Structures are given as C-alpha cells and as structure tokens.
Amino acid sequence: AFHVEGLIAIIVFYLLILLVGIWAAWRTRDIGLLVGGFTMTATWVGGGYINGTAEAVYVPGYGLAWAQAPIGYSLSLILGGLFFAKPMRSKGYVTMLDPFQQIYGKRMGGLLFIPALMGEMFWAAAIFSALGATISVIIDVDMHISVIISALIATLYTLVGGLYSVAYTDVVQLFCIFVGLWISVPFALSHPAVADIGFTAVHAKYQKPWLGTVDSSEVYSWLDSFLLLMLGGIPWQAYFQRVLSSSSATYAQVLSFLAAFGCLVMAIPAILIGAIGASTDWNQTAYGLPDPKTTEEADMILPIVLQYLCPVYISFFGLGAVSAAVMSSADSSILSASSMFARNIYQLSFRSDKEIVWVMRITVFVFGASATAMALLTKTVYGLWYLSSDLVYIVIFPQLLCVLFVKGTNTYGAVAGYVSGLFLRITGGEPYLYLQPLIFYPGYYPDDNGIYNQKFPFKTLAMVTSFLTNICISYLAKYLFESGTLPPKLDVFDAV
Ligand SMILES: C[N+](C)(C)CCO
Ligand SMILES: [Cl-]
Ligand code: NA
Numbered sequence: 001a002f003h004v005e006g007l008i009a010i011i012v013f014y015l016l017i018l019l020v021g022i023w024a025a026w027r028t029r030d031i032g033l034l035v036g037g038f039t040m041t042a043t044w045v046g047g048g049y050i051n052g053t054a055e056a057v058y059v060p061g062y063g064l065a066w067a068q069a070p071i072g073y074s075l076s077l078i079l080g081g082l083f084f085a086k087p088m089r090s091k092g093y094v095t096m097l098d099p100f101q102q103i104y105g106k107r108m109g110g111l112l113f114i115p116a117l118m119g120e121m122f123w124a125a126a127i128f129s130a131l132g133a134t135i136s137v138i139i140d141v142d143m144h145i146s147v148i149i150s151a152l153i154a155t156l157y158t159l160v161g162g163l164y165s166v167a168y169t170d171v172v173q174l175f176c177i178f179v180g181l182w183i184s185v186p187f188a189l190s191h192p193a194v195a196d197i198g199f200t201a202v203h204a205k206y207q208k209p210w211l212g213t214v215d216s217s218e219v220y221s222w223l224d225s226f227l228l229l230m231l232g233g234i235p236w237q238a239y240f241q242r243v244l245s246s247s248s249a250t251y252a253q254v255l256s257f258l259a260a261f262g263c264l265v266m267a268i269p270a271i272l273i274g275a276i277g278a279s280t281d282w283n284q285t286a287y288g289l290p291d292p293k294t295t296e297e298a299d300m301i302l303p304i305v306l307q308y309l310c311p312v313y314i315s316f317f318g319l320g321a322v323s324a325a326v327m328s329s330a331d332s333s334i335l336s337a338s339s340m341f342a343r344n345i346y347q348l349s350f351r352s353d354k355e356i357v358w359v360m361r362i363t364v365f366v367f368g369a370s371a372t373a374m375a376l377l378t379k380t381v382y383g384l385w386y387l388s389s390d391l392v393y394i395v396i397f398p399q400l401l402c403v404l405f406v407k408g409t410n411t412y413g414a415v416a417g418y419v420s421g422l423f424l425r426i427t428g429g430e431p432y433l434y435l436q437p438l439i440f441y442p443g444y445y446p447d448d449n450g451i452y453n454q455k456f457p458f459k460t461l462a463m464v465t466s467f468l469t470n471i472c473i474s475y476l477a478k479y480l481f482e483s484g485t486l487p488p489k490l491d492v493f494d495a496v
Contacts, residue, residue: 005312006139006319013320014153017176017327021169028167033251035171037258040242042170044077044259045177045266046329047130048123050322052382053267054302057274059293062382063212064201066222067274069386070267072229074260080234081256086249087404088240096240097344099403104414105493106349111418112399113344115391116237120337121367124330125374126384128154129299131326132375137303138319144376151372154330158364161331173324174262180321181269184306184314188276191309193284197272200279207293210278217443217455224457229386231463232393235400237336270302276309277301285309299381338363383432394425394459398467406471410495413474421466428458 049070056067093099097116101109131154132147141149161169188194201211214222246252282291285308292301306318342360378384398417402409429437431451437444443455480486481496 002140006135006316009316010135010139010319010323013176013316013323014327017169017173017324020172021166022164024169025165025167033254034258035168036242036246036251036255037262038174039170040077040239040255040259041262041266042174042177042325042328043238043242043332044073044263044329045174045325046123046333047127047322047326048329048381048385048388049073049263049266050177050181050270050325051130051133051299051302052126052385053270054274054277054305055299055380056382057210057271058277058301059298059382060208060278063208063210064271064275065212065214066225067212067271067382068222068226069229069382070263070270072226073233073389074263074267075230076233077239077256077260077263079230080239080243081253081260084234084400084404085243085252085256088243089246089249089252093240093244095340095343096235096237097340100399100414101344101348103403103409104399104411104495106344108411108414110345110349112396113340115395116235116340117337119236119388119390119392120333121371121374122384122388124333124337124367124371125378126381126388127326127329127333128371128375129378129384130302130381131322133300133381134303134306134319134322137300137307138315147375148372150326151368151375154327154334155364155368157327158331158334159361162335170328173328176324177266177321177328180317180319180324181266181273184310184318184321185269185272185276187310187314188273188305191280191285193281194276194309195279195281197275197279201275206281206291207278210275220457221455224460225386227460227463228393229389231397232389235392235396237340238332241332241336273302273305277305280305280309296379299379334364334367337367380432387430387432390430390459391425394421394462394466398463398470401467402470402474406474408478409470409474410477411493412477412495413470413472415493416473417466417470420469421462424462424465425459428454428462 053067053070056062056069057064088099097109097113100112128147128151131150132143135141135150136143136146189197195205200209202209242255243252246255277292283289287304287308292298292304297304303322306315310318338360341363342356346359347356374384395418398421399414402413402417427438428441429435429452431447431453434449434451437452437454440452441454441456441458444452445455446452478496481488481491
C-alpha cells in the first residue's frame with residue numbers, strides 16, 4: 001500500500017546530498033564568512049524549527065503569539081554573538097563544559113552535563129519525531145517504523161560522515177531546505193480548500209485565528225516562556241563548537257548574526273505552512289473529516305499540508321527539505337552529546353585513541369536509541385523542542401553567567417544554585433510531562449487534562465534564584481573560609 005515512489009525519492013535525495021559533499025571534500029573572494037553563517041544556520045534549523053513552528057502556529061491554543069521558539073532561538077544567536085562569543089574564545093575551551101570543569105571541578109562539570117545531555121536528547125527526539133512523521137505521511141509507512149527508520153538513518157549518516165571527510169554538506173543541505181520549503185508554500189497557498197490567510201489571521205472561520213492572543217493575566221507567563229527560549233537557547237555545544245573553531249572573535253560574532261538572520265528566514269515558511277493548515281477546509285481535501293487536531297495529529301500538520309495540499313513532486317521536495325534539516329541537525333546534536341560524554345566524562349574523570357573512538361561509537365548508538373524511545377512515546381514536536389532548553393535555562397545558563405562574568409564563584413555556589421533552581425523548577429510542575437505542581441503560585445488553573453498550570457513566571461524565578469544563590473553562597477563560603485569562622489578542614493571541594 002505504501003508508495004515506492006516516496007522511498008526511491010528519499011533515497012535519491014539522500015544520495016544527491018551526500019555526493020556533492022563528497023566531491024567538495026575531495027576538492028578541498030572573502031566569501032567564507034557567508035559559508036560559516038550558512039553552516040551554522042543549517043546546524044540550528046532542524047525538524048524542531050520547521051515542524052514545531054508549523055504545529056505551534058496551527059494549534060488553536062497557541063497561534064503565532066505563542067510560537068516563541070523560532071524567534072527566541074534566533075535571538076539566542078544574536079545574544080551569543082553580542083555577549084558570549086568573545087569570553088568563550090581566547091581560552092583553551094574545546095567543549096562548552098570546559099569552563100565548568102575548569103572552575104568547579106570534574107564532578108560538578110559532569111553534574112552540569114546531565115541537563116545538557118537531556119536537552120540534546122529532547123532536541124534529537126523532536127527532530128526524529130518530525131522526520132518520522134514526514135516519512136510516515138508522505139511514504140505511507142507506520143509511524144513507529146518510520147521513527148525507527150529515521151533514527152537509524154540519522155545514526156548511520158552521523159557515523160559514516162564522521163570517519164570520512166565532509167565539506168560543504170551543510171551548505172547544500174540548507175539550500176535544499178530553503179528551496180523545498182519555498183517551492184512548497186506557493187503550491188499550498190493555491191489549493192481551493194485553503195482560505196485567505198490574511199483574513200484567517202484576524203478572523204475565525206474554521207478555528208480560532210492563527211495570529212493568536214495573549215490575555216492580560218497571561219502576559220507574565222508569556223514573558224517567562226520567551227526568556228526561557230531566548231536565554232536557554234544559548235548554552236549549547238552545537239553553537240559553541242562553531243564559536244570556538246572560528247579564526248577570530250569578529251568572525252564568530254558575524255557568523256552568529258548571519259546565522260540568526262538565516263534562522264528567521266527559514267522560520268518564515270514554517271509559519272506560513274502552519275497558517276495554511278489553520279486556514280484549510282479539511283472536508284474538501286483527501287484528508288477528510290475529522291481535521292488533524294481533532295485526530296490528535298497536530299504535530300504532523302506540516303507533512304499533511306505537504307501531502308494533501310501539494311502535488312506529488314512538490315511533496316517530494318518538501319520531504320527532501322525536512323530530511324535535509326533533520327540530518328544537518330541530528331549530526332550536530334548526536335556528535336555534540338557523544339563528544340561531551342567521551343571527553344568530559346569518560347576521558348577526563350575516569351581515565352587511548354581507539355578506545356575513545358569505540359566508546360564514542362557506542363555512545364552514538366545508545367543516545368540514538370534513547371532519543372528514539374522518547375520520540376516514540378511523545379505526541380508533540382513543539383513540546384519537545386521547547387523542553388530541550390527548559391533545564392538548560394534553569395540550570396546551565398545561570399552557571400554560565402557566573403563562570404564567565406561573576407568573578408569569585410566557586411563549587412559551593414554552583415551546587416547551591418543547582419539544587420535551588422532544580423527544586424523550584426520541579427515543584428512548579430510540568431504540563432507536557434503530566435506532572436502535578438507541589439507549590440501553587442497565584443493564578444493556578446487546571447487545563448483540559450486536569451493538570452494545574454502556573455500563570456506566575458516561576459521558571460524565570462527559578463533561574464534568577466539559581467543565579468543569586470550561586471553568587472550569595474559563593475561569597476558566603478569565601479568569607480567563612482577566609483575569616484576562619486568555618487574550619488579549613490571542612491573544605492570538601494577545596495574551592496577556597
Ligand atoms: C534546540 N536548539 C536550541 C538547540 C536549537 C534551536 O533549533
Ligand atoms: Cl530545530
Ligand atoms: Na539542521
């Protein structure tokens with residue numbers, strides 16, 4: 001029943017992506033800055049960007065007003081270029097966890113690896129879910145098998161590309177994403193089922209208007225989420241790997257700015273596809289009634305629009321664009337997680353080149369399997385894409401601010417900030433993971449599923465409490481050990 005045309009199309013597109021990169025690696029006027037910016041854009045923009053942005057715009061509860069992850073994650077690159085690019089450079093940093101291990105120690109750096117590893121896993125699960133949904137809709141494959149196949153192909157791509165040389169694969173992949181999406185959009189807009197997306201943005205005919213709305217009581221919560229996506233999107237090894245490998249600090253800053261511009265440009269057609277899905281009379285298409293959000297297939301809105309509103313070859317171009325985005329992001333995500341585990345955890349704390357290569361291969365496999373299980377269990381792409389930066393914002397970002405800008409931080413403040421931020425984040429609950437809150441801040445309300453949500457900005461409160469606890473406990477421990485109030489024999493971490 002499945003169309004073999006789709007399988008042959010994804011095969012030929014994958015080969016077309018890899019062959020040009022192999023040729024460019026075989027071969028290899030002030031244009032390298034553009035190439036670096038395009039490569040960073042291809043690293044940043046994956047299945048999360050495209051599919052999660054379309055889902056967030058499509059879902060009536062969110063709209064464009066609540067599709068904050070594309071804008072926030074693009075602004076993360078601008079903020080990184082402005083403030084974090086120079087302090088991370090000119091030091092012997094290979095990974096993002098190197099400042100943490102150099103200032104707080106190996107154990108605290110390994111502890112800080114856990115939020116980063118969980119964020120990488122959430123991002124990989126979101127992009128695996130996006131690719132599996134695209135394959136399942138367009139090639140008509142079972143969703144579980146499609147997700148497993150996507151994870152397998154991403155794993156083999158990362159491994160095969162790793163040992164050999166790849167040059168300018170990301171440029172060609174970004175070109176494929178851009179062309180596929182921007183040729184899919186005009187075909188989707190001209191479908192007889194799709195109504196005027198300008199009218200649907202401000203008026204409701206099929207569902208609530210896709211521009212979205214923010215209530216006056218929700219404003220703080222909106223701001224809270226935006227901060228989580230704008231500041232929690234900065235401390236990632238996929239970005240700092242390109243920052244540290246640059247020739248100069250100015251080159252790193254300019255590639256950050258160009259990458260942010262490219263991310264916004266890539267986010268535009270995803271917003272348009274989500275708006276088209278929100279403006280579609282599904283009773284007129286072959287998808288039929290019920291509509292995708294009634295079917296609980298909202299997270300699959302972008303492939304559905306590609307499949308049921310576009311011709312078959314345009315659907316194949318869109319599938320190629322999604323595949324290019326997912327491969328170019330999954331390579332960086334898997335490699336960053338594996339490199340951080342191999343260098344910071346295995347090589348530095350516990351301990352050979354062959355041994356390191358082998359543990360990094362098996363780590364790629366285990367990370368892929370964990371992300372596959374997470375992708376199979378969940379039902380949302382935007383939710384995992386959002387949650388990837390949640391614990392990063394809560395935990396790593398205050399510690400990153402402390403190690404870069406706050407002179408005098410130590411391990412006691414790091415541990416205190418870790419515990420305080422984690423406690424305030426956990427006690428606030430998580431609706432995506434169906435967790436009840438223990439602390440009930442003012443404005444709490446139950447959703448459809450019965451989990452109490454928080455209108456109070458408790459995530460930003462947890463982050464700020466983590467930062468202030470780090471500073472206060474660090475200076476208090478320094479004062480207590482310097483003045484002689486606390487005996488020096490109790491300095492378990494030997495920080496001061
Ligand atoms: C999820 N990240 C923040 C790592 C990349 C944005 O797509
Ligand atoms: Cl993404
Ligand atoms: Na990508």
